[PDB]
Structure formats: structure tokens, C-alpha cells
Design an enzyme around this catalytic site. Structure first.
Site, PDB file in Angstrom:
ATOM      1  N   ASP B  25       0.768  -1.111   0.010  1.00 36.24           N
ATOM      2  CA  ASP B  25       0.147  -0.211  -0.218  1.00 36.24           C
ATOM      3  C   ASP B  25       0.822   1.129   0.040  1.00 36.24           C
ATOM      4  O   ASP B  25       1.118   1.745   0.856  1.00 36.24           O
ATOM      5  CB  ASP B  25      -1.055  -0.087   1.400  1.00 36.24           C
ATOM      6  CG  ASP B  25      -2.033   0.944   1.368  1.00 36.24           C
ATOM      7  OD1 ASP B  25      -1.817   2.013   0.451  1.00 36.24           O
ATOM      8  OD2 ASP B  25      -3.070   1.030   1.991  1.00 36.24           O
ATOM      9  N   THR B  26       1.321   2.028  -1.178  1.00 32.68           N
ATOM     10  CA  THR B  26       1.993   3.033  -1.335  1.00 32.68           C
ATOM     11  C   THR B  26       1.253   4.349  -0.815  1.00 32.68           C
ATOM     12  O   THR B  26       1.796   5.222  -0.498  1.00 32.68           O
ATOM     13  CB  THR B  26       2.347   3.381  -2.608  1.00 32.68           C
ATOM     14  OG1 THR B  26       1.088   3.527  -3.434  1.00 32.68           O
ATOM     15  CG2 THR B  26       3.019   2.081  -3.333  1.00 32.68           C
ATOM     16  N   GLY B  27      -0.095   4.252  -0.493  1.00 35.65           N
ATOM     17  CA  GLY B  27      -0.597   5.354   0.195  1.00 35.65           C
ATOM     18  C   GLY B  27      -0.745   5.230   1.816  1.00 35.65           C
ATOM     19  O   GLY B  27      -1.404   6.121   2.238  1.00 35.65           O
TER      20      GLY B  27
END
Ligand SMILES: COc1ccc(S(=O)(=O)N(CC(C)C)C[C@@H](O)[C@H](Cc2cc(F)cc(F)c2)NC(=O)O[C@H]2CCO[C@H]3OCC[C@H]32)cc1
Lengths: 99, 99
Positions: B25-27
Site C-alpha cells: 500500500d503506497t498510500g
């Protein structure tokens, strides 16, 4: 570009004639943008995240220009705290995770 | 590996002797795991997301083996609906976004 993750992966987008910054978010199925003036029809929807749910307006076939790439698809507008580019648009600009 | 985003970017992790699946999850700034039995001492914390906030237990210097790669860092444990590997660990396994 190649984006490392020591900082938040933010990009500039153009949508509905306006310039914004948004998070490239592999953890997001859909694209969710802060309250903004978007033209056209929209369907009410609810979406779930870490702290519960929020009501959003769903707009389909919306054009976004993301770091100089064009994509069209569904955009959700509502009380998100940050603008999120989700996988529905990430796939269109050819975005991949690599390690 | 290279991971395209047509489906959720799920990987198998091993943490605290248990096998789990978790979203790349880059967010997510931090790593957030569903309620699980972890051994260490923990600090109470609250984190915010799309629908509001959740109380979590923060554990520091936790070993996680993410798709075979080993990482050590902070893990948050609490009522997240999805196991999330955040950037604090993504950077340790050399994960990048590419388009
Ligand atoms: C302290 O450090 C932090 C670590 C994590 C978070 S955080 O709330 O988690 N956040 C950051 C924020 C920009 C949204 C990551 C994001 O990646 C979530 C991660 C996730 C996935 C999930 F399936 C269920 C969740 F509860 C959470 N995405 C999602 O909220 O997505 C919404 C809308 C888009 O479309 C959909 O896609 C999936 C769900 C829905 C915060 C702080």
C-alpha cells in the site's frame, strides 16, 4: 518515472480544468478526490476505509491527466482527507510495483 | 517481482510466527495489521484514514518477512479491515512505483 517510497508518492493531476496534487495509492481500488466542483451527472455512493465509511459522489468517464498521462474512468468525490489515485486509474498509466 | 495493479497487490507475510496476507500500500505511511497476538510491549496510538480514526497498538522493531524479504520496523495493530504494508516497510524491501 521510477518513484521510491521514502516520501509520499505525490503527483500533479489535472481534472475538471483544475490542478491538484494526489497520492499514487496501490492500496486504493478506486480514485477518491477531495470536495471539488466537477461537471455533469453523479451517483451517490458510500465507500469504506480504515476509520469507517464516507458518502461520495460517483462520476464516470472522467478524464484525468496524471503526471502527463491521460486516463479516463470513475472518480469519487467527497470528504477524503487526501486526493487518492486508485488502481482503476493506475492501471491505465501503466503503473507497477517493483521490488 | 514486478506487480501490475489489475488486482489488489497482495503478498504473504510472516509476522510473530503467523502467516497472513497483506496489501502492498503506497498510500499508507505506516504498516497496519488486523487484530493479532503480538508478543512485545506496545504504545497506544490513533491513526486517521478515509472514514475517521481507529485506536491501534504500536509495536516497534517487529520483524516481518514480506514475500521472502525481511524487514524490521513499526507495526500498528488494530481494527483495520485489511492488513496493510506501508511505506515504512516498503522502503526496506526496495519497493518502487514505475510508470
Ligand atoms: C499512520 O499510517 C497510516 C497507514 C494507513 C492509513 S489508511 O487509512 O489505510 N490509507 C491512507 C489514506 C490516504 C486513504 C491507505 C489506503 O491505501 C487505504 C488502505 C485500505 C484498504 C482497504 F481495502 C481497507 C481499508 F480500510 C484501508 N485505502 C482505502 O481507504 O481505500 C478505500 C477508498 C478507495 O477505494 C477502496 O479501496 C480499498 C478500500 C477503499 C492511514 C495512515
Amino acid at each position: 518515472p521510477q518513484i521510491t517510497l521514502w516520501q509520499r508518492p505525490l503527483v500533479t493531476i489535472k481534472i475538471g480544468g483544475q490542478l491538484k496534487e494526489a497520492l499514487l495509492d496501490t492500496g486504493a481500488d478506486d480514485t477518491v478526490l477531495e470536495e471539488m466542483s466537477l461537471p455533469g451527472r453523479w451517483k451517490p455512493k458510500m465507500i469504506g476505509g480504515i476509520g469507517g465509511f464516507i458518502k461520495v459522489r460517483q462520476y464516470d468517464q472522467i478524464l484525468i491527466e496524471i503526471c502527463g498521462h491521460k486516463a479516463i474512468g470513475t472518480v469519487l468525490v467527497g470528504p477524503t482527507p487526501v486526493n487518492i489515485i486508485g488502481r482503476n486509474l493506475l492501471t491505465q498509466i501503466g503503473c507497477t510495483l517493483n521490488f
